[PDB]
Amino acid sequence: ASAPIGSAISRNNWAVTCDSAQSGNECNKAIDGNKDTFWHTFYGANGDPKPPHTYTIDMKTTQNVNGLSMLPRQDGNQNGWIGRHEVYLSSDGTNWGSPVASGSWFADSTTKYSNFETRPARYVRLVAITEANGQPWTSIAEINVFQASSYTAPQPGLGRWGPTIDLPIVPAAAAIEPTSGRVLMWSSYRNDAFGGSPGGITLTSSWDPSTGIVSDRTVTVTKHDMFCPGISMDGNGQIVVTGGNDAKKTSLYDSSSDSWIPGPDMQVARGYQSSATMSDGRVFTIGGSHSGGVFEKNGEVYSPSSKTWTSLPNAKVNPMLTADKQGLYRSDNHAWLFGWKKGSVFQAGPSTAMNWYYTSGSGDVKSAGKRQSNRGVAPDAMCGNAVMYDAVKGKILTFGGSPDYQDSDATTNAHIITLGEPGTSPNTVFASNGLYFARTFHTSVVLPDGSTFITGGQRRGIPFEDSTPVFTPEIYVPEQDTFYKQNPNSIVRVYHSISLLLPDGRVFNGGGGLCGDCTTNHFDAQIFTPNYLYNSNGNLATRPKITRTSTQSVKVGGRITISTDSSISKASLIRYGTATHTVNTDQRRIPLTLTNNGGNSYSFQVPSDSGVALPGYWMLFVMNSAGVPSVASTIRVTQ
Ligand SMILES: [Cu+2]
Ligand code: NA
């Protein structure tokens, strides 16, 4: 199921307006309180007008609206079930403006919701852009509008959340399609659950920021239920999805052809393992005792070229196990892995013990000591996040998480780890004074500017329960060694939520739930707009534009020349991310050293070490002096 974020508004006083209504299926049937009556557009004898169909409400008075519920027709007929939709709010009934929510609802008869941030409005409009089976009609049994108890306007300078993207599924795994810029999400065998899966099928969905279209598709070709997997963008730009509900499979998503392809079977059955692209475009994986068995799952490496999985038995999982109360089932999951120099992989936690994984020979592991600082040794941080905000200086920021996967309190620990040469004990220090808010199951992304956006989670980890939520996000400014709160959101984002950086510099935050029947499913995502895109007056700043690229495919050590429309102060390369279960081994940022060629022409070299400039797709962003970034340019980096 799902739930609204506010309380239902009384329908005494409403005045409803519909585009069409068939006698018997009147406009008001949707607001009578009886699940048996339903509004229906013209049909048969009145003809068959196609969508968009519109349902407008006049509340008479101004409310702190925060949501809507759309219960479809419950008579077993599917006719009129809304697919594509849009929700608008008006204070006057004439000036609607931009939708507070839009997206697609799944083709079923469960109550559909639109949860969005609180906005005072007297009028509400729901536009049915599409019927779910491609029919001309729209039908609604009952319709409700929710309200917040109070209204507090976002503070200036702290970002803004909104709009809400409505999805057919709970996006528990996601990825950016590099060549298309679309956000790819998957659930499992069902749109809202994974439990007792027959395996072999995965429900996927995509959102296109350019066209605003949300679409879904069942993937059966790789005969893999992609829930709870390893995710890596390999050397060739393919997304490698391993195990999970089908513990030994490998599925490959090719962005170019926008197709799914079957890969070789892993050597070892795994679930909840982390996987990391290596300096040579290969994929390394270790642990994953959630699926395929609970035992010691040592390393394995995938070669895109030969299309084989090879076991690395001396790349031992043992030194990286946390001290989880549930033992091995949890202890080897979601390792904080980073591909580094010379086929090496660094493991930064969650265990207190950090390690060096080597991929030469039948593998190896070497200790890197302990995450610690002046305040002591850092405890296990299962579900803490790890972000490489400066791959050049080998900087990794670590935060939050808990000793045990669940039923454990989260912490505010935060650390800066600096990597050197593989085999060496990196330097770790505490980050400022820690997070403002203790959290676990939170997500994060490194922004164009090297700052890390931190959002969601709860203070005590209890999967599928939206208890002790943190709605106030935080941004860590590396240069200042300071954390800063941002405007809070209204949707709880705890277990199974995700975050990805969008090519326009905005953050896509969504998901949480995937517990079937529970009311904690969240079939959506919100957009967070960082203050870097707003000018002094709360308006959107003007963006520098990248008018030309010498090329869009470059070798490590290679050079790129660009022309801009305006003078730019800084530049950065951000590798395209993949996310699920708090793990994102794909994102990393490389700060660029720009050569001014005069005339708004600049050149830069892409780092020569492929362990720094890991092969795959990257977004190129340029910032003016004001700090406003351009929309990314996509650059393919080859080793
Ligand atoms: Cu899970
Ligand atoms: Na009704």
> Strand ranges (DSSP E) for 374-480?
376-377, 385-390, 395-399, 414-418, 427-430, 443-446, 452-455, 474-477
Total residue length of the chain: 639
Indicate whether 101 and 119 sit together in one domain: yes
The CA distance from 190 to 438, in Å, is: 32
Distances from the Cα of 576 to the Cα of 251, 321, 588, 629, angstroms: 18, 28, 8, 17
Query: Which one-letter amino acid corresponds to residue 276?
Result: A
Q: Which ligand is nearest to the CA of 581?
A: 1
Question: b/e for 143-162, b at 16 or more Cβ within 10 A?
Answer: bbbbbbeeeeeeeeebbbbb
Query: Which one-letter amino acid corresponds to residue 486?
Result: Q
Contact 533, 479 (CB under 8 A): no
The C-alpha torsion from 544 through 184 and 232 to 295, rounded to 10°, is: 150
The CA distance from 485 to 59, in Å, is: 35
Question: b/e for 484-500, b at 16 or more Cβ within 10 A?
Answer: eebbbbbbbbbbbbbbb
How many whole angstroms from 407 Cα to the centroid of ligand 1? 15
The CA distance from 452 to 234, in Å, is: 24
The CA distance from 310 to 302, in Å, is: 6
Q: Which ligand is nearest to the CA of 582?
A: 1
Number of Cα atoms under 13 Å in the Cβ half of residue 459: 9
Query: Which one-letter amino acid corresponds to residue 146?
Result: F
3-class SS at 452? strand
Partners of residue 144 on adjacent β-strands = 69
How many whole angstroms from 495 Cα to the centroid of ligand 1? 7
Q: Which of 432, 284, 452, 456 is nearest to 383 (CA)?
A: 456
**Structurally, how many domains does the chain consist of?**
3
The CA distance from 468 to 460, in Å, is: 7
The CA distance from 145 to 114, in Å, is: 10
Q: Containing H/E element for 147? A: strand 142-147
Number of Cα atoms under 13 Å in the Cβ half of residue 351: 25
How many whole angstroms from 77 Cα to the centroid of ligand 2? 15
Contact 556, 613 (CB under 8 A): yes
The CA distance from 175 to 185, in Å, is: 6
- The residue whose two tokens read 């803004």 is 160
Q: Is 532 a catalytic residue?
A: no
Q: Containing H/E element for 528? A: strand 524-529
Domain end: 153, 175, 199, which one? 153
How many whole angstroms from 32 Cα to the centroid of ligand 2? 5
Contact 564, 544 (CB under 8 A): yes
The CA distance from 194 to 205, in Å, is: 16
The CA distance from 25 to 46, in Å, is: 13
Strand order in the sheet with 474-477: 443-446, 452-455, 474-477, 482-485
DSSP 69: E
Which token pair is 638?
A: 């080859």
Domain end: 128, 153, 178, which one? 153
Question: Residue 475 is part of a domain; what is its CATH number?
Answer: 2.130.10.80
Question: Is 496 part of any known ligand binding site?
Answer: yes
| Breaks in the chain after (C-N > 2.5 angstroms) | none
Contact 295, 306 (CB under 8 A): no
Indicate whether 349 and 483 sit together in one domain: yes
How many whole angstroms from 22 Cα to the centroid of ligand 2? 14
Q: Which ligand is nearest to the CA of 141?
A: 2
Indicate whether 35 and 72 sit together in one domain: yes
Indicate whether 491 and 564 sit together in one domain: no
Indicate whether 145 and 183 sit together in one domain: no
How many whole angstroms from 333 Cα to the centroid of ligand 1? 11
3-class SS at 31? helix
Neighbours of 210 (CB within 10 A): 10
> Strand ranges (DSSP E) for 270-332?
274-277, 283-286, 299-303, 308-312
The CA distance from 239 to 225, in Å, is: 15
The CA distance from 317 to 328, in Å, is: 11
Neighbours of 75 (CB within 10 A): 13
Q: Containing H/E element for 328? A: helix 328-331
Q: Which of 77, 68, 209 is nearest to 131 (CA)?
A: 77
Q: Name the active-site residue from 43, 495, 532, 617.
A: 495
Indicate whether 508 and 419 sit together in one domain: yes
Q: What is the resolution of this structure in A?
A: 2.1
Contact 67, 4 (CB under 8 A): yes
Q: Which of 631, 637, 606, 448 is nearest to 547 (CA)?
A: 631
How many whole angstroms from 182 Cα to the centroid of ligand 1? 24
Indicate whether 432 and 548 sit together in one domain: no
The CA distance from 472 to 493, in Å, is: 11
In sequence order, the 6+-apart residues with CB closer than 8 A to the CB of 419 are 338, 340, 346, 394, 395, 396, 426
Query: Which one-letter amino acid corresponds to residue 234?
Result: D
Query: Which one-letter amino acid corresponds to residue 535?
Result: N
> Strand ranges (DSSP E) for 15-111?
15-18, 39-40, 53-71, 84-90, 101-104
Q: Which ligand is nearest to the CA of 580?
A: 1
End-to-end Cα distance, the chain: 47
> Strand ranges (DSSP E) for 361-442?
364-370, 372-373, 376-377, 385-390, 395-399, 414-418, 427-430
Which token pair is 565?
A: 């429309």
Indicate whether 517 and 561 sit together in one domain: no
Neighbours of 8 (CB within 10 A): 12
Query: Which one-letter amino acid corresponds to residue 319?
Result: P
Contact 393, 479 (CB under 8 A): no
User: Cis omega before residue 168 (within 30°)?
Assistant: no
How many whole angstroms from 160 Cα to the centroid of ligand 1? 29
Domain end: 504, 523, 541, which one? 541
How many whole angstroms from 543 Cα to the centroid of ligand 2? 48
Q: Compute φ and ψ for 205, nearest 5 degrees.
A: -150, 155
Indicate whether 521 and 562 sit together in one domain: no
Question: Is 272 part of any known ligand binding site?
Answer: yes
Indicate whether 218 and 266 sit together in one domain: yes
The CA distance from 579 to 229, in Å, is: 10
Query: Which one-letter amino acid corresponds to residue 452?
Result: T
Q: Which ligand is nearest to the CA of 26?
A: 2
Indicate whether 37 and 171 sit together in one domain: no
Question: Residue 11 is part of a domain; what is its CATH number?
Answer: 2.60.120.260
The CA distance from 401 to 437, in Å, is: 11
Number of Cα atoms under 13 Å in the Cβ half of residue 222: 30
- 586: containing domain: 542-639
Indicate whether 132 and 184 sit together in one domain: no
HEC secondary structure over 162-184 = EEEEECCCCCCEEEECCCCCCEE
Question: Residue 607 is part of a domain; what is its CATH number?
Answer: 2.60.40.10
